[model samples]
Target: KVFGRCELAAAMKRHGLDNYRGYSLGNWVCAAKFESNFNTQATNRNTDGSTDYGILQINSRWWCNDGRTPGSRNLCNIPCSALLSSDITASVNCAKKIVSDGNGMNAWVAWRNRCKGTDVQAWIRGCRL
Candidate 1:
């Protein structure tokens, strides 16, 4: 499902994304904007044959098992397609795992290049979060 801006903020918070690993709700919201534009089914194939899946673009190489990413660990122990589900529960859970890594939100290039060190508060400015 495609989420409204504020809707995504609330949903991320509901899924425990708020301040997860020092990354704020707005950081997640901003990353989602650049990563998937809040579309749950978004997909992008990387040069290494690993595919990125879902709203946060969790990768298949190290996170989800797609049977395509070479040497995939399936650390999230979920199918990459699960990240595309409209429910977003698994997606959020996997995203949490990604952020829990030592690199934190830097695991997502979109977050680092676009949202990092920026004023992401504006992404949720008028919202009632």
Candidate 2:
């Protein structure tokens, strides 16, 4: 897992995602906290057997290929296992693309339930980014 909020903020900033797609850095940070608790390898299975991927908890239903699950939209054109690695490049790239649709950040339930309109300043309180 990443070290702390600052570490993630720095990473996102380096990746040009700190203020990506007109969303604030805090939104990304807060969503990451609840979605996967900053764990890159986090995977949560859905009742339908689809899985969440990486730190963003990106769904295999629409984002990536999960091998056993065929016919995924694979909007990111990437394998889900690639997202489980330490590199946030694939994760952040796909997340930015997903949010680019009119759906905005609403694509992520964790962002809506835990981040939207909430006081998330603590997420980037001391980040050098």
Candidate 3:
């Protein structure tokens, strides 16, 4: 599912990402925009051979278990396939786990490069949430 900007914002808000770990909803929304453009089925293979999965692009290196990454911690304990579903609840939960695992929002370079140190109000400007 390719979510609309505000639609993804509202979804993130519903999953407790509004101020999760001191990261604003806009931060999450903005990261998702750059990470996957709100596409739930998005996937990207890194130069290091690890793959990123789903809306927030959680990586196979440390998060989800994709079996191909040799030393995967499977920290989120979810199959990489789960992140690709249109149902974003698991994706959001995995995102929360990633942020909480001492990485904060820095787990995503997309967020670090763009959402961080920027006023992301426009990411959720009309969400009304």
Candidate 4:
């Protein structure tokens, strides 16, 4: 599940984190590390049988299945088994959409503000994607 530099770049672009100053791939990689230790197969239990999955720790049963039930295009519906098949671009994009009106980098900014200094480690300690 190694992402090439170009693929990582594309993922960053999709999230709007490709800017030289603002977000960047390095921040995303750090976020992933903080979220699930870069484990795409990671899952966490929530209330009632719902579960989160992937490196981004997306809540599949809740977010994805709920979206399908509502006839929406949930990225979580892509299936956990196949979640890591790609470079996590879709999941990152969806998260950006939810957090920053489709601005992936903006989402990173928010992530940095909240999770960077406290919950997760600082954004600069990890390797660049």
lDDT of each: 0.91, 0.87, 0.89, 0.53
Which candidate achieves the best lDDT against the true structure?
1
lDDT of 4 at 13: 62
For candidate 1, list the clashing residue pairs, or say none.
none
State candidate 2's TM-score: 0.94
lDDT of 2 at 115: 92
lDDT of 2 by residue, 47-92 (tens): 8778998889999988899986766689899999988989899999
Poorest 10 consecutive residues of model 4 by lDDT?
119-128
Q: What ranges in model 3 sit over 4 Å off?
A: none
> Against the correct fold, how does model 1 do in TM-score?
0.96
Candidate 4: segments with Cα more than 4 A from true spot: 2-16, 19-26, 66-77, 101-114, 118-129
Query: Cα deviation in Å at residue 4, candidate 3?
Result: 0.2
lDDT of 4 at 123: 42
lDDT per residue as tens, model 1, 1-129? 999999999998998988888888999999999999999999999998999999999988899998888777899999998999888789889988888888888998989999999999999889987
C-alpha lDDT of candidate 3 relative to the true structure: 0.89
lDDT of 1 at 103: 84
Model 1 residue 29 lDDT? 95
Weakest lDDT window of 10 consecutive positions for candidate 3:
120-129
**What is the per-residue lDDT of model 4 for residues 1-129, given as tens digits with 9 covering 90 to 100?**
545444554565665665434444555665666556666656676665666656666655434543333333454446545555456765665555445544444444435664554532234334344
Output the better candidate (2/4) by TM-score. Answer: 2
Per-residue error for 105 in candidate 1, Å, reads 0.6
What's the TM-score of each model vs. the native?
0.96, 0.94, 0.95, 0.53
